[PDB]
């Protein structure tokens, strides 16, 4: 029966491959050759958020596109005011090895996780005003990789246990778990309708999940190595994945396959963080070679390089208005480009 | 703008407080040296952890081991709560001064696995600047094993019979040239991987430890002293 199971799995894989091949009309490059190229894009460093002692893994812009949270391996969750270049808060964590941080859409709460297998939620606008550990979310067996507030009560959290979990901050319990992966899931990105997110794992596959149903709808494969960065196209019907094979892909949920490769020959370093502009034309990708890159999502032609970091860049976020992008890197500096 | 001015002064005061506390934390972060402890289950890394704990407290998966010797305190990190795949969370330990590797010196079956693990550590793109403090643990078990027969390390490693003990040996009075040859053969195996990459930017410091080896914190103390010394010499123009 097991041999029959493998044979029928092969038949289903052949069926999905045939459907993908049939649905492939032409290349996105051919149909976007009627667009004029964007042109060279120069974004100077407006700020250099300089208050971190160790390397920085994650940053997350706020809803107001003014305040942001940055997590460094010293054990701090410094919340800055980008316009004023001021640190409105400096949250002392418990475990210094933090890998993620999330700023809630409302702004009342901030999350952080890491090697402790715990997603800690901090309330900011508390009665006194001193930041405290609001909740301690336990249940992940592997390390913690990416936290993202779905709202003030829930949070989607990826871990090193190949499982994602939709949490309930009010009670501290997993409402529904997303267990369909093979490798360690690193980055997750929520939809504009906050109903279908993706989980980018170390099995060269990103899977699309239902927040309410709790079961994967469509898997997305085609990468050559582990993906540790993922972000939806601003509508929610496409996303991009950055892996260690020095390429960024564009997967289309409607067509259920890859659209275009974003990779040059001279780049041989893995992408660490990806993010789109407010129109979805500037797919910024942070690479291990101490600098970022800017791509034209419709032509794959690289237009702009956000160099300026002395160590590996690890986090990358674009303001909800698209007026800035902050690239926190391992040199403990958050340079806000414009 | 007077209201805006006073509210922004209420922000610069918070910034000043945060700066003061961050300098105070800087006077604590650079005064401690984070250490990372790897190894396998059979390797008695927990015994060394307890021994240096006597010279602090943690039960949340990652067993921190705070210990000070000569008024300087290191911070060991016994991370073991994660899965068997470690190619992604090992990148957090890039700024660690030294990776502590405890190898089970009395296991011939699982010794090639330890060399493979060391080779992976010695060649990571994000670990290629971290010197390793090798710890060949419980040499007493190896001494008992070689001195009782059925210790054909020449079988599991075929290049033992065609091997001779190094001239730069340090034998204890009760030792046997045979157990000395074996225990330096493991060391030379690890240094063979050590002296094959990492062009003068990180070094493997090998040390022999038994089960009850009290002088373990001081050995790491001196090794870290040398590590910091070398990084300062390349940090200056001396090199």
């Amino acid at each position: 029966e097991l041999d029959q199971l493998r044979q029928e799995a092969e038949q289903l894989k052949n069926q999905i491959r045939d459907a993908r091949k049939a649905c492939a009309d032409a290349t996105l490059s051919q149909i976007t050759n009627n667009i004029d190229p964007v042109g060279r894009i120069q974004m100077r460093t407006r700020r250099t958020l300089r208050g971190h002692l160790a390397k920085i893994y994650a940053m997350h812009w706020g809803t107001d596109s003014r305040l942001l949270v940055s997590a460094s391996q010293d054990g701090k969750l410094i919340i800055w005011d980008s316009y004023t270049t001021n640190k409105v808060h400096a949250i002392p964590l418990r475990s210094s090895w933090v890998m993620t941080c999330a700023y809630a859409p409302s702004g009342n709460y901030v999350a952080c996780g890491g090697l402790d297998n715990i997603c800690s939620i901090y309330n900011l606008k508390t009665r006194e005003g001193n930041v405290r550990v609001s909740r301690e979310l336990a249940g992940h067996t592997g390390y913690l990789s990416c936290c993202r507030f779905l709202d003030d009560n829930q949070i989607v959290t990826s871990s090193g246990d190949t499982t994602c979990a939709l949490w309930d901050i009010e009670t501290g319990q997993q409402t529904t778990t997303f267990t369909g992966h093979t490798g360690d899931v690193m980055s997750l990105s929520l939809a504009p309708d906050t109903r279908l997110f993706v989980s980018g794992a170390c099995d060269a596959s990103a899977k699309l999940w239902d927040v309410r149903e709790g079961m994967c709808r469509q898997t997305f494969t085609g990468h050559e190595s582990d993906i540790n960065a993922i972000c939806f196209f601003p509508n929610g019907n496409a996303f991009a994945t950055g892996s260690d094979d020095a390429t960024c892909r564009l997967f289309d949920l409607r067509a259920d396959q890859e659209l275009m490769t974003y990779s040059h020959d001279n780049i041989i370093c893995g992408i660490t963080s990806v993010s789109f502009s407010k129109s979805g034309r500037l797919l910024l990708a942070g690479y291990d070679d101490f600098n970022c890159n800017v791509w034209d999502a419709l032509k794959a032609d690289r237009a702009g390089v956000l160099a300026g970091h002395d160590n590996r860049v690890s986090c990358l976020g674009v303001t909800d208005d698209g007026m800035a992008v902050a690239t926190g890197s391992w040199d403990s500096f958050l340079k806000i480009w414009n | 703008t007077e209201d805006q001015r006073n509210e922004e002064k209420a922000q610069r005061e918070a910034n000043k407080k945060i700066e003061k506390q961050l300098q105070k934390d800087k006077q604590v972060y650079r005064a401690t040296h984070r250490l990372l402890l790897l190894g396998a289950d059979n390797s008695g890394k927990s015994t060394i952890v307890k021994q240096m704990r006597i010279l602090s407290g943690g039960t949340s998966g990652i067993f921190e081991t705070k210990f000070q010797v000569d008024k300087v305190n290191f911070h060991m990190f016994d991370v073991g709560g994660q899965r068997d795949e470690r190619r992604k969370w090992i990148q957090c330990f890039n700024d660690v001064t030294a990776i502590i590797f405890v190898v089970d010196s009395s296991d011939y079956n699982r010794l090639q696995e330890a060399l493979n693990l060391f080779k992976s550590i010695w060649n990571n793109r994000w670990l290629r600047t971290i010197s390793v403090i090798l710890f060949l643990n419980k040499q007493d078990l190896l001494a008992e094993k070689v001195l009782a027969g059925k210790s054909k390390i020449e079988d599991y490693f075929p290049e033992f019979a065609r091997y001779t003990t190094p001239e730069d040996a340090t034998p204890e009075p009760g030792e046997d040239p045979r157990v000395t040859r074996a225990k330096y053969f493991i060391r030379d195996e690890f240094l063979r991987i050590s002296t094959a990459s990492g062009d003068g930017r990180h070094y493997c410091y090998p040390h022999f430890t038994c089960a009850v080896d009290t002088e373990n914190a001081r050995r790491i103390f001196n090794d870290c002293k040398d590590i910091i010394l070398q990084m300062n010499l390349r940090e200056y123009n001396l090199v």
Partner: nanobody, 126 residues
Framework: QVQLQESGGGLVQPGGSLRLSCAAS????????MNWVRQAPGKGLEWVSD????????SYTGSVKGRFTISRDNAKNTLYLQMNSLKPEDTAVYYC?????????????????????RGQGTQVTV
């Protein structure tokens, strides 16, 4: 998708010769340090040998050093492991494993839990 399918393998007398082949697919083959991993019956996963991108960093496991000779044909996306003089110890399930990061000389693929880039494997009965 990343698909490493193992061919060869079968009944072996104590001292037979087999051409273990790994028809890999789904990526540019000549960019990864391919390596072999065994699965001894009732025992954990162990490393067999590895070969670099070009074939200049060949390294064998300690136990079987002269019995096994690995060789990759980069233009055929394959990993050969010429296994002659097979002892009963080599009655394991061999696995053709690819290191995750392109252009690197190390990888953590001895993981008992399913490593993402590792084939289904063949059983060689000696």
């Amino acid at each position: 998708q990343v698909q490493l399918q193992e061919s060869g393998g079968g009944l072996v007398q104590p001292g037979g010769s087999l051409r273990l082949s790994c028809a890999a697919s789904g990526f540019t083959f000549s960019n990864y340090k391919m390596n072999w991993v065994r699965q001894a019956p009732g025992k954990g996963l162990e490393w067999v040998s590895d070969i670099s991108q070009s074939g200049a960093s060949i390294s064998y496991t300690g136990s079987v050093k002269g019995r096994f000779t690995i060789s990759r044909d980069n233009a055929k996306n394959t990993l050969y492991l010429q296994m002659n003089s097979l002892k009963p110890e080599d009655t394991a399930v061999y696995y053709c494993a690819r290191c995750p990061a392109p252009f690197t000389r190390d990888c953590f693929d001895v993981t008992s839990t399913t490593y993402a880039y590792r084939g289904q494997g063949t059983q060689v009965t000696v």
